[PDB]
Symmetry: D2
Subunit: 492 residues, 4 copies
């Protein structure tokens, strides 16, 4: 008998043990959490608006011919502003994939600009990390621009940018324009206007949302905390909750506000998690603000929301699509528990089960490769011929990569986890493709973390191994505590 587990696509994955029974408040981001934007339509809209802003501000008319290609960008790429590269890197700064425009650079050539295939993430001035779902269009746009200027006759390619006559245009200054333009599209409400004038096209709607939030509110408190203003929030949330019946079968509809003990807009995250801004109440009928302490607030800070709800830190499960630094953990008061929404997980899981044959083959090749070396040790002069096998391993591995997209898996390249995966393991207690998967779990559930196995763990059997062990290895090899010395796996 093997362990029971819910169906794969309904699962909530566990990084750190979490006893859901102790959770008293449920907190939601809105954007890409409750309001899931349809893909690739939303990225494309963001792409078009940014390109148009750039053109309206001096960039060549050629850009208007770019079309967003959803198959190219993977989230979490690092843009190197010195050399104009998109880089997929691991948790430690090692290069996995390097693309200059649409040209993927192989290993040997990479060492020219990166002699140890290494970058220092610390160099925030040089390296910009494109972690967010909103960063997707600009990730593609950056590649489009570098490709454009590289192959445009009017320009002269250099190491750190382009010559336009006697004039130099660095990748760095070009990056600033793109960054400024993306900011512009968002904060000018250009994007927001187009989204609300066509909700069906851009925003996913699902009857399960009101059901899950309903059930949460029966067991504890529910709050929203979004950077968006009330007006846009009201438009979006009305849409999400717009069904002829409430969530209980045969029940009548009710306002989205009804599902919340506390609604917070203009959150200004991430400053919100520090001292944020003064909390003010919102009169929804007039739109008049008033500092101090209806259930609609603007601004404030995470500590203030925690006070308003009568919650302590670890009583709160905060659900959202965004990875924040160690900011919460640094404070002297208890930080929140976290649930990270990662929509790509939906596609990634499909590859995991539907491309089963590719994994199979990779495993056979590995098994056969080990056979070739089976009889060899340090006294062996033999050099088995493996070039055919490797060649096939590379071909199958690349096919697998392409299953995810041109930039491969969000979580890995080959045997290496990405910086993004590493950040997920660091910040998220739980994760899933959507928060709606909580539907499939009781509120008393004990979320238990599975071990992440090191090589000597994953590849050594618990079977007792039947010559003496070298003393070079064994080194010639207080009242002890009578009760368990740690408690992180039970969450108590």
């Amino acid at each position: 008998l093997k362990k029971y587990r819910r169906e794969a696509y309904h699962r909530v994955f566990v990084n750190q043990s979490l006893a859901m029974e102790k959770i008293k408040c449920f907190g939601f981001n809105m954007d890409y959490t409750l309001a899931v934007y349809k893909s690739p339509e939303y990225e494309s809209l963001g792409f078009e608006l940014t390109v148009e802003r750039l053109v309206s501000i001096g960039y060549p008319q050629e850009l208007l011919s770019f079309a967003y290609d959803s198959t190219f960008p993977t989230r979490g790429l690092v843009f190197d502003t010195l050399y104009g590269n998109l880089l997929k890197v691991d948790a430690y700064g090692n290069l996995l994939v390097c693309a200059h425009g649409f040209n993927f650079i192989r290993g040997p050539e990479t060492r020219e600009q990166y002699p140890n295939k290494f970058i220092q993430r610390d160099d925030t001035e040089r390296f910009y990390i494109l972690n967010t779902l909103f960063n997707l269009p600009e990730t593609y746009l950056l590649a489009c621009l570098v490709d454009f200027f590289t192959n445009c006759p009017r320009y002269t390619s250099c190491e750190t940018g382009f010559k336009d006559g006697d004039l130099f245009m660095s990748y760095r200054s070009m990056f600033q324009d793109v960054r400024d333009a993306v900011d512009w599209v968002h904060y000018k409400g250009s994007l927001k206007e187009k989204t609300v004038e066509n909700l069906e096209k851009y925003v996913v709607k699902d009857g399960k949302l009101p059901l899950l939030l309903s059930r949460m509110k029966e067991v504890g408190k529910v709050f929203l905390a979004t950077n968006s203003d009330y007006k846009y929030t009201d438009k979006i949330m009305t849409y999400l909750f717009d069904f002829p019946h409430g969530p209980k079968p045969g029940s009548s509809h009710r306002p989205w506000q009804s599902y919340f003990d506390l609604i917070l807009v203009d959150a200004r995250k991430p400053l919100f998690f520090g001292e944020g801004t003064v909390l003010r109440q919102v009169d929804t009928k007039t739109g008049k603000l008033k500092i101090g302490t209806g259930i609609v607030y603007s601004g404030g800070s995470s500590d203030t929301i925690c006070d308003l709800l009568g919650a302590k830190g670890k009583d709160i499960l905060y659900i959202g699509d965004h990875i924040f630094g160690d900011i919460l953990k640094s404070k002297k008061r208890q930080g929140w528990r976290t649930f990270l929404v990662i929509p790509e997980l939906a596609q990634e899981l499909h590859v995991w089960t539907d491309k089963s044959s590719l994994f199979e083959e990779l495993q056979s090749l590995d098994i056969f490769l080990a056979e070739l070396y089976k009889h060899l040790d340090s006294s062996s002069n033999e050099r088995p011929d493996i070039s055919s096998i490797q060649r096939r391993i590379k071909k199958v591995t690349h096919d697998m990569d392409m299953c995810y997209g041109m930039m491969g898996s969000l979580f890995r390249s080959g045997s290496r986890q990405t910086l993004f995966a590493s950040q997920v393991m660091r910040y998220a207690d739980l994760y899933a493709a959507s928060f709606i998967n909580l539907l499939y779990y009781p509120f008393s559930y004990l979320f238990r973390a599975a071990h992440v196995l090191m090589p000597h763990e994953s590849t050594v059997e618990h079977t007792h191994v039947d010559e003496m062990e070298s003393p070079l290895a064994t080194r010639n090899r207080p009242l002890a505590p009578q009760e368990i010395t740690h408690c992180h796996d039970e969450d108590d």
Copy 2:
């Protein structure tokens, strides 16, 4: 048919793919690599000498009654100089185990001093990491001292140290004395004198060492680079190579120097990996030094050794017990490949296979626990009674911990890898309990990294899962590259 693998205790574990065929130079640290100090005798010697230095310098006579307890210290603990705690932490700064003297502090009480069970490793002034094999005696000694002053009537326990009358003695200032004393024992040659006057007692000897080094020298170059001076190095290495026959059966003995293309002493690592010090030649018969370019050198730097050997960075496999920062990777020239000797691996592997029953039980408890929640989802009001099961999971888990020692595994506590494990995954291409395990591998071997699986990977089957998937999860879902975009898994 499953994959062939060498016997567990002969294995070399792989973090990053490494084609041994391309390795042209083999580099060794001496201390705890070629010269493996017998345990716990060596730690005990270091312990006694440090305690005696402290007493000779004003600390109470009581200390002379301390005896080194090999079952207490695990390597890689963080000493918190503010509160006088030994901390086992994970890769991200989360507390796993907290010991004040010999008192292990449970969770609730920990939040008093660590409200989020979190420390900031960055705080190098506050937190000191005891990563080295030499740090073992002092790890125990620190616990001994805090325990001593806490339970000694002559003193008054405070949060950040002790009152001795109207006088305050902080943990921080006490830590400085211990650190100074350990330094003193090493650099005063006190420890070295006792070691060489009794090699059999303190230093492991193994005929396989000359064999492996012999074979390495047949295929490439071999060098030694040690911080020790030539005199101590000569004493130790003569001992290690002292057998009636050479390594080949029936062969005559030969000098240890014969096994090296290049011998470097007074290396002053880690400055050695930067610009180090001016390289000087050593006349072994006279002991006279001479800057500039026999095969014995003193000082110098890693770039200079690489030049002397005609090697490029990635041609070099550097074998040793020490984890260095990103120093090598930061340079503009190719860094070395790495093999990390981790002697504790010898004991850890024994636990893995000999305590099979404990793992079994833990797994059954997990399987049964999942049965209890099997029929429950968010509509369930049920709260299954699990306290008996958890209680048993804690008991079995603690028994497992104690198998490693009072401070548990070097690599983990529960479902969480330690900071030390994390550093191993970051720095070491390969690791083993000893470098001698290379004996069991041909020089043409392709070391291949195994994936470290995330939760959604390790707990989801490649079996195609047979209601529509929520659009909240799926989001209502350039010439592509025709060849593999990465190469780190083949090392080419």
Copy 3:
């Protein structure tokens, strides 16, 4: 005799020597340099707009009762977001003046929050330095807010903020709203709109400006580099040059653009001094932009947008060395840290006009303080370590404090921009660090020939300023403790020519 100097109010002051003959390009910021905003009318406008913004988003109506008070703020104060104090500090982080709202904290009381009367400037998270002229209304508003929440009984004062019932309202979060509101006023354009609709009220103009700029362009190139957009710049500049004559009276007026070789708008300083943004050239006839340089005839326009200081150098055919950059802002070590040559600097500090008036018109206060100081020395004369005398100086100290406070108030409630008592302010040390030349206005360059060698004055230490260049005869031998009893064969040869040249600027 005595050294000839120009009239005090026409002087350019010299921190580091500058041979004007080598300057080939003159660069100008616009705001508070060419366009000098009327005071206190312009500060008061910024204040009211910022106040109104805060009220419009929830701050109490009582804020509307506050009137801008130009006598209160001095530039360069540090706002401590932890304790809600405005601090006047010296170059080394020592506290000189501490105001909590409009309450000045003196001596011993300061030690409760600042145990060594010291802050660590590096803590940019905690301390915000209000260095700019635009920061003036902000400086006053912070004080108004701390003061109001303190006096208003609706709010309960704590060390790090106020409680409004169950809600804590930290000084840090209140500061954030003030910063947001100041930005909003500036970047939504309310301030610019009010400005251009009454330029006579808000903007100074002087016929000497076209004159000086025309002379500059006879010996070199002249450029404008401003963060403002072209529309605003054009409105401002047209006004500055709007006289019924050109550079000289009786000459034809000409358009302001005719005075420049290059006009750079939307500069995005300080990013501008790094890699900035892609340079575009602007067609003002059309309003369209194009990145790079126009290929056709439009290339003969001179209006550009974005770019970087390196790019501007290239366009002008200049090396940094031969550019004098004239403006009101102090930048960091950004320029000199580069591999590229940095610009010479002239810092405009308009408060100098008022400060020099105090220095010169309040001479009797300076004279009394000197007399009192001389009298104190007299009281201790002929006393040494064997002496038991404790002369009573309490009356003299009381007068010193009284006259010194009177002097302070001549500058304003926060004292001089440049000092408090014997101590220079942080702002003053930043001036000495960043500016080669400084004056109340760049217009003082009118009074110097372009061949002028500006020579830096020595800044004297205590042992230099209080000891004469006169042979001091000693009766007894000097202590070997002081002298150190001071009076192989290889010795280096001494240098035969001067080893430094920073004072001649003569490369």
Copy 4:
């Protein structure tokens, strides 16, 4: 009249006001404070020992040919480990003097390695600042080494070091050997041994020292705090106090220990100013130590080892405020950054003795420079921006450079410790930052009563030092560009008493 001042060579100079009456505890460093080492004999000893050490571990025999040259090094030079230059820099990182070996790099050439003639001091990895008196022989040795490897044909000069055949030998790694060797000489005790075996040759002594210390102890407590061990301290101190009389001639000699309330050895400064090491009390009769304080009669000894400055404060029953710490070392913001009160400071700077002699005995050089400066001003008099004149100042500049170099060489090859031309050195700015009081020796305190109020002198900026306190009458109205045209109902009330007190030190 004119202000009374003590004789220049007896003066204590004041950076920040200090009411001596409030000082209740006097603390002393030993090295270069109480034990002033003979110059240049002691520098030369350190030099030779360090040279010998380097030779003994592989450096060429030719190093033995170098003789210490006291006329070369000035304290506070920055060694650039990248390019192998000794740099004299100002407070802001600007280059004043650059020496590569014994070759001085001038003007334009400096720009090749320093494009803006600027270094970033923060780059502690690259730049090592040689601030201490012990660093003097080291400063000279670095120059000797760069010079020797440059001239010796066995080695080929590169930008960042030398090639010895196939071996590269970077300036950074060579610097590391020099640092290691200096430490070794100090910490193996070779230097201490040579010192104590000839104290008359290496250590100054003055009967005024016991005198001054005895007076201090009549008004307050006196303590010693030294990094040295008791054995060395005892040998040094016994020598310093070895006269056939006590404090006053004709009085009985007494042991040096009798002059102190507390003797702290093995202080491990600067860690000492943090948490240091556990305090132990030393029994000098026995030589044994015990952490904490002796419980029995031994508690009446006064020799301690290790500890921290906070602990020492506690032992003395003093608050930081009332301790004056006298020594030759400049510490960082360590003390004032603490929640605990920091110590007042008297900085001993023995070079001041020679510097003051130049200031006073070379008056004719100062007079010529003033004349030349006045003549330059005359040549530009009555010229303004309309003027085409380019007066020829080349002859005057040449003389200025010549006289200025002559002045420099009066101090040494690297010029004054405190300045180069019109610019203060980094060292000078650190003095102003760290020291309340300074002098060539603490012995000058002999010439002041313990009731003395030390009053800081203003450090004048250019617009203060070159403008008189005299009413300046203006014919034409001042430009609104300079004045800003400067001349709700709620206004704050002005402060009625002085808002700062750092100049009276009167809490």
